[PDB]
From a paper:
CRISPR-associated transposons (CAST) are programmable mobile genetic elements that insert large DNA cargos using an RNA-guided mechanism. CAST elements contain multiple conserved proteins: a CRISPR effector (Cas12k or Cascade), a AAA+ regulator (TnsC), a transposase (TnsA–TnsB) and a target-site-associated factor (TniQ). These components are thought to cooperatively integrate DNA via formation of a multisubunit transposition integration complex (transpososome). Here we reconstituted the approximately 1 MDa type V-K CAST transpososome from Scytonema hofmannii (ShCAST) and determined its structure using single-particle cryo-electon microscopy.
We reconstituted the ShCAST transpososome by mimicking the natural configuration found in programmed integration. Using single-particle cryo-electron microscopy (cryo-EM), we obtained a high-resolution structure (3.5 Å resolution) that was sufficient to accurately resolve the interactions between all components within the 961 kDa nucleoprotein complex. A 3.5 Å cryo-EM reconstruction of the reconstituted ShCAST transpososome reveals an assembly composed of one Cas12k subunit, one TniQ subunit, one ribosomal S15 subunit, four subunits of TnsB, and two full turns of TnsC with six subunits per turn. In contrast to the heterogeneity of the recruitment complex (captured in the target pot reconstitution), transpososome particles reveal uniform TnsC directionality, in which the N-terminal face of TnsC interacts with TniQ at the target site and the C-terminal face of TnsC interacts with TnsB. Because particles containing 12 TnsC protomers were most frequently observed (73% of particles used in final refinement) and yielded a slightly higher resolution cryo-EM map (3.5 Å versus 3.7 Å), we refer to this configuration as the major configuration. TniQ bridges the two TnsC protomers closest to Cas12k, however the TniQ–TnsC12 interface is much smaller than the TniQ–TnsC11 interface (325 Å2 versus 915 Å2). We identified well-defined density corresponding to the TnsBhook at 4 of the 6 TnsC protomers closest to TnsB (TnsC protomers 2–5). To distinguish between these two possibilities, we used local refinement (focusing on TnsC) to generate a 3.2 Å map, that is sufficient to unambiguously distinguish between ATP and ADP. This improved map demonstrates that ATP is bound to all protomers. Comparing the structure of transpososome target DNA to B-form DNA, we find that target DNA is only slightly underwound compared with B-form DNA (11 bp versus 10 bp per turn) and does not match the layer line spacing of TnsC in the transpososome (~40 Å). That is, the last two TnsC protomers in both configurations interact in the same way with TniQ, resulting in a translational shift of TnsC–DNA interactions. This leads to slight variability in the number of base pairs contacted by TniQ (5 bp (major configuration) versus 4 bp (minor configuration)) and TnsC (30 bp versus 31 bp, respectively).
Author numbering:
A (entry chain S): 2 to 88
B (entry chain O): 2 to 144, 173 to 406, 412 to 635
Write the structure that this text describes.
RNA sequence: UAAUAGCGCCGCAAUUCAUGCUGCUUGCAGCCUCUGAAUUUUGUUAAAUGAGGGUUAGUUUGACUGCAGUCUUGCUUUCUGACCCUGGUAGCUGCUCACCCUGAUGCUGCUGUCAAUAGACAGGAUAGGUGCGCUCCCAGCAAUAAGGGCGCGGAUGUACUGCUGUAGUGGCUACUGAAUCACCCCCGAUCAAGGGGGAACCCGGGUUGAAAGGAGAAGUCAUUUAAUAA
């Protein structure tokens, strides 16, 4: 999981205001940071079957938050996808 | 009659690495030739209807793949190994599917036919006695009885009077006076409905999957799933089912179906050596215990005897039949050809060891080849016949071999073996003309000094099943079971039963027609559980877990095979019969042997 | 302190016969000295089973020829012995927790010493409960079965381990500590390789624990762990 400094850095950059501890844009940015660091380890230690459980949860949570934001506000959804480099 | 023996093969890296590269490259057309039939082939449903693969189709898919830029680097015998394996994969899978289709139809007839006594009265518009009288007429006509009654129901509808034929069939081809409980009938008719449902859920089976060593689909899916967003729950789960899949680490084995495509020799150091057709640069050294060495010396003696005799003796009687070359998985770190272990598994027909046994195979093949030639009676067909006629003349020229008189047993003395859940075996030796039991054995006698091993097997199954549960909750790789102990116990009983059959000069060993006990129990316990937890499906599954699990762990097919193998190596005939539903384990064994004796005519 | 009960095994006490023991009537009479089946009972320095994790190309189960002489290979497994350990730091990573109640196929349970903090040090497979074990039972913990209660911010169009967080417990990779044995001791080789020196006993030769083998490929179902979904 992320360092303390790394979370604080990510919430301050995706949060719309000093009040955002966990808007849908902050929650997807923290799952995205985790997934990138986890793909770099799980492709190397292919035998680590306890980390595949962690990845498949963490990707599935991101997709639900994105589908919710798509219907709620397509402009916020489009800007979030750009800023996270997703397709 | 056949057995498999084995040795590890040793050879310097360059040879164990070159062979690995050919098998990692061969393993791939073993997958592309399944896909060329899995989805590509248009006729596939005609094969599923017939239950058999056409004898040339895999070769006709492989021949143009021999020049493929991906597959072209391999010897002519490695392509025949590919064609062999893919032929056997589908020739098995289609034959599994056909018997399931036949069972589903063969019970769909019965679910339509199985009626309550009140339904027979309504459907006939007549009395249940009129039905008993017509059932008595049908038995009088009939006198394969069960088959004849199913034929007489298919044909001959006879103004719905075939309802009386269904009355015979549900009563086990016999007349019955009693009128049945509709609750017992409801359980009975429900078991048939459950078996129909489960057969369809099984018949919808997966296609054969090849050993993809590349991880390419898995790596592509990983980078897809982590960098992109799925458009559907079905797509997000499709990536999960791929990412959870464990990939294979070993290529398919080479199969050498011609015994002469292995060449044997003796090394300067006195050790035995082998080489394969198309790999004749790569000499390998045999390493095996002296408990098995006598076959590997016999391989070389069979070969030298033919070569010393200007090919006038045939490998139609060579002790080696076919070889399967396989990489057994090693442990720790290293390149695959330094980590794994080349092992050569030789199929051997054990009755070729002796001269008296070789003469059986000479007569068996000489009769089969004579018939084949007379059935053929083409261009290359003319050369196939010359090869068969030349085998038929050469097979008469004998190898110098060990002599041992054949076993002979008394045609009236039989060993009955009774299998069950609590007693894996129990034995009665019957003189069938005296109607006299010569001896009985229970398990405590039937493996003597080893009787502690049954208690060990039950402790080990229970202990290890709990440890596997605890280990899975922690994602530990430690996953172990009593399978090799159960295999040893089934072999101890197989030796003791045949030693007992030899002791009393028995003419045969009798084994029960157990059939598919696992599926039968699974439907009986479900039809019952549905009456005790209606609507609560989780409670229905929990109803008798330990009984259903003990039936799925019951090794009856492996004990039946272990006895068959050891009996046929000794020369004792195997016979079969219905095992009684009631009586003690001894009475079951007694009546089983007497039933198999009564079935002689 | 506690663990009374339930369930599975292990013998021990009997009772009933036989697949056994004496006869000739080759099928009866007779009993339980053995060897075995069935039921019941029992937990008496009775007897018998008895899963903390690991270690040897180990020994014996082998082939051929008339029980004697030749040849012998180190494969895949099951036991019995014996010995060793109860681990070390260097990264990567999963899960779990605002705080409470219920407490799960949940974790933990040995001897001695110092602390009496939660942990070190030295011993060790006798290691909570019984003759021996359990998903059962007792004791402590319980966030990491599950359900319910419920505080304050963000979000609030159905998403919300998403906040209250530095520890707990795992997984994996690299290096490393001990045993690398089959009567002990010593020097080595692990796709190979053996050699040297002793103790004890039997009648200068042996002995110094035994067993099993049909394998590959594909498909399926049984519970049981994880993820996902309505």
């Amino acid at each position: 999981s992320l360092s303390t400094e790394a979370t604080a850095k990510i919430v301050s950059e995706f949060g719309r205001d000093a009040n955002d501890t966990g808007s849908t844009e902050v929650q997807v940015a923290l799952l995205t940071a985790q997934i990138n660091h986890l793909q770099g380890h799980f492709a190397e230690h292919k035998k680590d079957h306890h980390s595949r459980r962690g990845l498949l949860r963490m990707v599935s949570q991101r997709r639900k938050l994105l589908d919710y934001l798509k219907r709620k506000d397509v402009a916020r959804y489009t800007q979030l996808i750009e800023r996270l480099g997703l397709r | 009659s056949q057995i498999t023996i084995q040795a590890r093969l040793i050879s310097f890296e360059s040879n164990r690495q070159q062979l690995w590269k050919l098998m990692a490259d061969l393993n791939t057309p073993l997958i592309n030739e399944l896909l060329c039939q899995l989805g590509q082939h248009p006729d596939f449903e005609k094969w599923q209807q017939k239950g058999k693969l056409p004898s040339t189709v895999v070769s006709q898919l492989c021949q143009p793949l021999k020049t493929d830029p991906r597959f072209a680097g391999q010897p002519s015998r490695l392509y025949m190994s590919a064609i062999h394996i893919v032929d056997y994969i589908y020739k098995s899978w289609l034959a599994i599917q056909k018997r399931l289709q036949q069972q589903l139809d063969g019970k769909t007839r019965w679910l339509e036919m199985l009626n309550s006594d009140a339904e027979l009265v309504e459907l006939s518009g007549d009395t249940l006695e009129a039905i008993r009288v017509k059932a008595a007429e049908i038995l009088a006509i009939a006198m394969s009885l069960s088959k004849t009654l199913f034929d007489a129901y298919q044909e001959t509808e006879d103004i719905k009077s075939r309802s009386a034929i269904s009355y015979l069939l549900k009563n086990g081809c016999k007349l019955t006076d009693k009128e049945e409980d509709s609750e017992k009938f409801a359980k009975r008719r429900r078991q048939v409905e459950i078996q129909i449902q489960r057969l369809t859920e099984k018949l919808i089976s997966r296609m054969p999957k090849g050993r993809d060593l590349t991880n390419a689909k898995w790596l592509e899916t990983l980078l897809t799933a982590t960098t992109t967003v799925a458009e559907d729950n079905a797509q997000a789960k499709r990536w999960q089912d791929i990412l959870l899949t464990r990939s294979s680490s070993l290529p398919f084995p080479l199969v050498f179906e011609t015994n002469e495509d292995m060449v044997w020799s003796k090394n300067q150091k006195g050790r035995l050596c082998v080489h394969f057709n198309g790999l004749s640069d790569l000499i390998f050294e045999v390493y095996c215990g002296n408990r098995q060495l006598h076959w590997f010396q016999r391989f070389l003696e069979d070969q030298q005897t033919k070569r010393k005799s200007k090919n006038q003796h045939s490998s139609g009687l060579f002790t080696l039949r076919n070889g399967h070359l396989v990489w057994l998985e090693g442990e720790g770190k290293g390149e695959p050809w330094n980590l794994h272990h080349l092992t050569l598994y030789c199929c051997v027909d054990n009755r070729l060891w002796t001269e008296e046994g070789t003469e059986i195979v000479r007569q068996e093949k000489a009769d089969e080849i004579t018939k084949f030639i007379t059935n053929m009676k083409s261009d290359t067909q003319q050369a196939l016949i010359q090869r068969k006629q030349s085998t038929l003349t050469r097979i008469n020229n004998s190898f110098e071999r060990p002599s041992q008189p054949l076993y002979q047993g008394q045609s009236h003395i039989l060993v009955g073996v009774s299998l069950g859940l609590e007693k894996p075996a129990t034995v009665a030796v019957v003189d069938a003309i005296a109607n006299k039991v010569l001896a009985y054995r229970s398990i405590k006698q039937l493996l003597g000094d080893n009787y502690e091993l049954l208690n060990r097997q039950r402790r080990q199954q229970q202990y290890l099943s709990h440890e596997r549960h605890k280990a899975q909750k922690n994602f530990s790789p430690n996953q172990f079971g009593a399978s090799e102990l159960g295999q040893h116990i089934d072999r101890l009983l197989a030796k003791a039963i045949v030693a007992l059959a030899r002791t009393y000069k028995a003419g045969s060993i009798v084994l029960p027609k157990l059939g598919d006990m696992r599926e039968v129990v699974q439907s009986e316990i479900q039809a019952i559980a549905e009456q005790k937890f209606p609507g609560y499906i989780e409670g229905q599954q929990k109803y008798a877990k330990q009984y259903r699990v003990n039936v799925h762990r019951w090794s009856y097919g492996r004990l039946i095979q272990s006895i068959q193998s050891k009996a046929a190596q000794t020369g004792i005939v195997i016979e079969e019969g219905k095992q009684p539903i009631r009586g003690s384990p001894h009475d079951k064994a007694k009546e089983l042997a007497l039933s198999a004796y009564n079935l002689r005519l």
